[PDB]
Amino acid sequence: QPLLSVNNLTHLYAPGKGFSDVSFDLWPGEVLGIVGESGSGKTTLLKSISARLTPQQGEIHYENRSLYAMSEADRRRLLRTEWGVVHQHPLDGLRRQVSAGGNIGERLMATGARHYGDIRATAQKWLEEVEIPANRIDDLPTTFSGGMQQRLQIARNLVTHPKLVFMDEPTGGLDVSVQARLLDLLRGLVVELNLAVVIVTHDLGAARLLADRLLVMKQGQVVESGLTDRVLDDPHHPYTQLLVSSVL
Amino acid sequence: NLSGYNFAYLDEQTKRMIRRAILKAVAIPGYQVPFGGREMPMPYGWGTGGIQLTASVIGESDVLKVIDQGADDTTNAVSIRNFFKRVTGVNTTERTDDATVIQTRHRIPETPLTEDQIIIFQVPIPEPLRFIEPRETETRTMHALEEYGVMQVKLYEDIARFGHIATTYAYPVKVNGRYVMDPSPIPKFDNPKMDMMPALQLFGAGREKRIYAVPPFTRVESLDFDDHPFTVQQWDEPCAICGSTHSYLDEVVLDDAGNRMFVCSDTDYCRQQSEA
Amino acid sequence: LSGYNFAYLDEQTKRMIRRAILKAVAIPGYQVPFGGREMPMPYGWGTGGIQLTASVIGESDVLKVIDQGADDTTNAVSIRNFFKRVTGVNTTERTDDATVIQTRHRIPETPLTEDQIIIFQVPIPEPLRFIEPRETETRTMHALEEYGVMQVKLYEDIARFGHIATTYAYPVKVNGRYVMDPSPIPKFDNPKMDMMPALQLFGAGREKRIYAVPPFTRVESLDFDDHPFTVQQWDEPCAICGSTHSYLDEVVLDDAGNRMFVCSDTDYCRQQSEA
Amino acid sequence: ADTATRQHWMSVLAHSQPAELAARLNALNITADYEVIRAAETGLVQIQARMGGTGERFFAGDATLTRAAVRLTDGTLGYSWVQGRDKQHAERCALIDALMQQSRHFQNLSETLIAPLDADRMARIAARQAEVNASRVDFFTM
Amino acid sequence: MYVAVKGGEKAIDAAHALQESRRRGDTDLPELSVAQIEQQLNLAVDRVMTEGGIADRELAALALKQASGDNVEAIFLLRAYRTTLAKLAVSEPLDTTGMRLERRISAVYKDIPGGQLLGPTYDYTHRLLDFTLLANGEAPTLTTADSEQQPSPHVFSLLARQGLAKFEEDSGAQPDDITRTPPVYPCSRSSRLQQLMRGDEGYLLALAYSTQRGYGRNHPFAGEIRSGYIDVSIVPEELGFAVNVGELLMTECEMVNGFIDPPGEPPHFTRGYGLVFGMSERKAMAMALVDRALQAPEYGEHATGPAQDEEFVLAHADNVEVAGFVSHLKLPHYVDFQAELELLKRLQQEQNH
Amino acid sequence: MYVAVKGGEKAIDAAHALQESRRRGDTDLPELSVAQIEQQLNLAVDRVMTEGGIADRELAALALKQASGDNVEAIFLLRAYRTTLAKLAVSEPLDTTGMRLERRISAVYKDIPGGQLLGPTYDYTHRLLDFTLLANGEAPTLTTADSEQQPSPHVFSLLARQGLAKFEEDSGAQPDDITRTPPVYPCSRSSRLQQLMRGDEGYLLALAYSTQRGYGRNHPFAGEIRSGYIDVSIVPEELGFAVNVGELLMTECEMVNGFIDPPGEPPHFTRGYGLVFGMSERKAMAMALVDRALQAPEYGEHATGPAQDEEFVLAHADNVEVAGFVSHLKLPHYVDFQAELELLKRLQQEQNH
Amino acid sequence: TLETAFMLPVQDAQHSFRRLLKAMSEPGVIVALHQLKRGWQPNIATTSVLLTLADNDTPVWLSTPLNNDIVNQSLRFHTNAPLVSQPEQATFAVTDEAISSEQLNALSTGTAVAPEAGATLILQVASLSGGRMLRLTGAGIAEERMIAPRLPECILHELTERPHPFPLGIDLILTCGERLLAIPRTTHVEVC
Ligand SMILES: [Zn+2]
Ligand SMILES: [Zn+2]
Ligand SMILES: [Zn+2]
Ligand SMILES: [Zn+2]
């Protein structure tokens, strides 16, 4: 049955701002993208679904368990053992004073690794997995580049083999070459690991490259369910045409 | 007691409050129980929490032993002992075995403690996560959820940066298998003495308003990795007086030429060994 | 004859302040750092203005010290008495008779003429300080002339209230290049700074900055076409002189709520009343 | 005597300076055998203020307070709570509180002791207020 | 061979004798009495009473004398003495509206009902050292005026009557006492105010200065500074009615701050409050500014500067705690340093055999 | 019909007369001498000298007397007096090794060469208010010992000779003088130290406390605290040789901080330095801790806590500036507040329905 | 009318607290509180515990069998504690072997973020030896302690199952005559 069922989620902190009557389901291994204007409230949807913002009304059902029915400890554990969150700003999801190896192995240690050699070996393996050179494992995030910081964030979140990762436009602020290479790496990871990805972006190019199914939101509600190369090339509802033409 | 102050200098209300806190802490080993500490004659940072704890537990028939840095004659130790003789009149002893209540600062006596003995610790920072997470609003929740990952992360970072754990005193210890607790800033040489000890251990942070405890015969395990096991301080030299190799030594600089001697930190233990 | 050096300041301090003044005049709007000393008045009570006046004042000068536009305000009285003690110069309450004017939060209603110098007392000599508290950052902003953040704040104010929340110390562009804040004067007084015939000096002793506007310089308040620069307005005239073109201040007469509006510029009020 | 008048003389006694009260009582040379049920005790009164002057309450420190109680032979109880630390003053105030509750002493003391003390305090207040009003700033007239 | 000896007790005895001798100073000069200190060093006594928690002038002056004039040591002495005393009663809430004014100023209006009473202040004085104080002087003769006290309503009462400010309404909430229980962040405004009142004057002044300089701007105006005598009243158990126990010299400061625009309601000024013992105003102004800064959560303001950080501001505000823990480093710490030395020597031996 | 009267100067004069009369206090008590303050309130005098910038005990005591004991006002009086005086010479660098010790304590070793000289101190005293000081008594006679000062090397000399720390090398860089030019951030360590020494004791203490509680820890140890007399020497133009002009009572604190591991040399302890006038240790200790905290850029450390932020720490350290600006709000601001009221009244009327 | 209290309140309170601390820190150890010569009927141990711990800050709830008027007056006069009517508000819950399951479940067990906020249950039992044998292990016990108190079924269920996981829970203080026994929330109990 779908791994993340969203049923009529609404939250409007300020008049209009926020989202309302949002419903959909997610199956394992499929990438669902979210596209909309900055005021669309898509980002608020991302916080609400990513066990961070309590909705005013609606229901989330991770696996067959209401998300917010879980105790604070249960959802806190979920956000660090089986779920992943990739913030736009790496320093938000990365511990700045902790070396890259420590950032990657913090999840393992929170699970109780209790073996330095194994933790360091796993950290090096994951640094290789994301193309970061392994020679600078002991380095710290501030000494990395933006693309390298992003790669480190994905490695940190994927160290535990999460079955569902949310991604709040991690490519923002990256060059076209770096963005494309990072997206290619993300495609490789997504196909290699059967983990669902919920990617929120403000541009259609990233969704085209990465997403499998696409959703469009306007002013805090779902506009039309989509699909790669269908909504992108065949925008039905007029705002969809406006968006694609604005990109074009 | 003829100083005009209530026995132990504390009003009965404060003593009752501290006693309730002590009982709650004993019922929840390793948990920092907030308590309404007052201002003692000795300044905050100078052992007011331990002073209040011992004032709440000390009685007429108890034999008090106050040691600072493991020495009875340390200036702060003698000051606290004089205060308690003035406001309590109890007997004071420098021998660990004779003492019934031991108030220690930064050291655990070398002589093992028997039952019915209470050792009271003066802790400046009762939170083991304080230096990783300075905010109490965060560390309180971290303790509630048993989210002690950052401690292991800090140990891992120390190993990566230096090749060894950089914490040498106030070493965090998991007590009873659930709560990670910060002992007094005792050297990691002393953590093994805290495991399954026959005596009740009380830790009081007067400045930080916290009381916690370890009941007798409780599991206390210092955090570490399997491939980097917990170790203790080592010295090549024995005690320069008693010639003991099983005691925490301290360094005394005899002259500017660089001549130095290492002597037992526990003065009572050194005295006992030398007279043998 | 007070036992201190004339104007209370030693010669080298006067020279340093004078070099700072010349540099500031050569760079209209730039905040020139200067090593100000501690004056008998506390920091924030007008030490910068006092130091500037001491550096520029001479024996033949006629000094007018006004606070809130009034000559009899407590701080104005204290500063004027200090200057009378340490210099003995002549003091006046009439704007047209004063060669040097030291003002705290007003530009006199009476227009200033040539050869007059007006010293402004500035608490915060930085229009971007409440946006970017770091001096290390505002300094480079001024160096590169990156004032977009000021426009951002103005637009945010318009969005939140529909109006520029700033009402005094309103930033102004000088000589088309430097955004500076004037003294904490109302928006009412900003127009008076444009193409003024009198040199304007601004001094912040606590923040240790001197800047200036030469005579006949363009001083344009920041605004937008959709939101033209407005000025404080009242529906009442001065309760004493009856003037409708002066910055009024409110005086509460009794707890019942009775109040009267009177000209802030007491000299201008006196001139109008005697007419 | 209603509680208003008792409050009045208790306030007058509390605000009176210890020295002047002692001098007044010695001059009056009043004889009244009594026993101190509660010896003058010094402690704290927790000062409680309102945020904003009229809003929620909050604790604003403490002030030293000396309290005493006295029982006369007949049975009347006098109490005193005086801010400060003078035990003798508190005991004297309690004694006068006890005395004022007796018709034999109320009329005499209210005119010979309480009224002069209140007048002296009011005179001091008026003098101080007169010398302080010289610092008022004048702006307008008529 | 060496043998340990006892020298701690005699060493501390000698040190305390030396400190007492130094405090007495030159025996030729007469020992200054506590009355002289509480009369002529009144501004130091004001800070000592405010931060020590006891509003007794003689006790504060005695602490200052015993502390060799050290404000921190005197504050700690008074605070420690506080523990000894018992709480005989809790006063009725103070009514500042009925204080015998000795000073009343407002920066928001040129003139206000009751006038601008400057009172005894150092403001507008030229801070030039008065060397005539090196020799005994003559008591100045004070001029006088009419002795009547004009009605002096609070400026915020006037503002609220116009609708510009919001009245401070009492909900009957029980105040939080930190002396009874340790603070638990986030703290309610009552406990925040209690902690600020007994906070370091210098620390609070620095935080308020930072807010004024842009680190958490709040746009403050000195709405009302008001120093005078407030009557203190209690309600004993023996007598069911209220009894006036005396009066305290209190300084009350109320700041007008940047107005807000709540939804629905019209915009209004926000306000800050401060209250101290004695005639020292600057502490009250700093308390008001920091209080307004810490009110940020109620108005949903993003903390821009540390002055808006409740944890950081209130954790380090207390003189006794702060001073005690900085000075604790003077205590022997050679066991911990021996541990550090052992580790460092191991590291040095490893890197450079 | 109203008319504007002129009543500012008379009010100012009356207020100042009232303040002077209040400072004199009751005329029955003899006016306390400046010598009495200098001798018996020596710790307040020490703080005033340190933060005022002049190491003259009599001048600091005079400032305290003129300020009615207010430390901030006295500090400002002394700082303002500094301006009038002319700089006659610049002393040769102080050699603290020649200090004639009155107090020397090391917290890092049980015993040191020269011993633990406690000297006069309030440490280890039970802070119980001594009510025998209400009535003057007589100080006890001081016991004596051998009158020779055995060599007292600095503890960091011992540590550096072991290689555990690094000697502070003199590169000949010209010290920065904030008193001559306004501070410019980032600041050299000389300017930072000069600013810290003039900084407020309470603010620096709070910052050091915050660092000790985890807000950017530096793991401090009181390596050595020395109080004693240091000789002062100058080289006049008209004489080609140095001349000894006197001696100052100064306190020096040197703090061992957390060790680092430089890439190309063995790990070693970092150090902090504090130096003040008089025998007020805690100011020197806070100075040393904040000095180490502000050394973050030199060691490439991330600014975790506010105490590590150089601009924030130093822009608000100056007691004189902080106090003056916080106090400026007592000045009339009714023009700015009238502008704010005009804006607010319009905003309210726009949304009035 | 009012019941008497400790003859020497300070010394007796200290001695009783030390005995109670010995009992609590070493679960299963029976201690005697001999300082009070007569409890406020209905025992001595319970009265000593209330006199040495309860005060104005600790609401006390007395079960109906023990909720006598004289004892209420004595608690108000001596301890000054507030006597609440519902177990939910009780910091100290005093009851006997008649305690019902609902009453036991109503007690405050604290919160995971502040487990000390819970309530302490003082249970009066017919005897401390003779009931179902129980084995105790955990903090305070070297190897294992065997105690056979005669206490209700609901309490046995609470101890053996611990429905509220650590740190949540209620510390139990069994009393009988002048003798006392303590079982903290961290003790693992198992029938025989
Ligand atoms: Zn320590
Ligand atoms: Zn030995
Ligand atoms: Zn201003
Ligand atoms: Zn007019």
Residue numbers in the entry:
A (entry chain I): 3 to 250
B (entry chain D): 3 to 278
C (entry chain H): 4 to 278
D (entry chain A): 3 to 144
E (entry chain C), F (entry chain G): 1 to 353
G (entry chain B): 2 to 43, 45 to 194
The article reads:
An initial map generated using 901,800 particles resulted in a structure with an overall resolution of 2.2 Å (using the gold standard Fourier shell correlation (FSC) 0.143 cut-off criterion) of the C–P lyase core complex bound to a single PhnK subunit as previously observed. PhnK displayed a significantly lower resolution than the core PhnGHIJ complex, so we used 3D classification with signal subtraction to focus the refinement on PhnK and obtained a final class consisting of 50,323 particles at a resolution of 2.6 Å. This map had improved density for PhnK and allowed for tracing of the complete fold of the protein. Variability analysis revealed several distinct positions of PhnK representing a hinge-like motion of the ABC domain around the site of interaction. The specific interaction of PhnK with the CID of PhnJ is driven primarily by electrostatic interactions involving negatively charged residues on PhnJ (Glu149, Asp226, Asp228, and Asp229) and a positive patch on PhnK (Arg78, Arg82, and Arg116). These interactions are further stabilised by hydrophobic interaction between PhnJ Tyr158 and PhnK Tyr118. In a subset of 3D classes, additional EM density was visible near the P-loop of PhnK. The density overlaps partially with that of ATP inside NBD modules in ABC transporters, but the lack of high-resolution features suggests that any nucleotide binding is disordered and consequently that PhnK is not in a catalytically competent state. In summary, we conclude that when a single PhnK subunit binds to the C–P lyase core complex, it is structurally disordered and cannot engage in ATP hydrolysis. Moreover, and in contrast to previous observations, we observe no significant structural changes in the PhnGHIJ core complex, including the putative Fe4S4 cluster site, upon binding of a single subunit PhnK (rmsd = 0.5 Å).
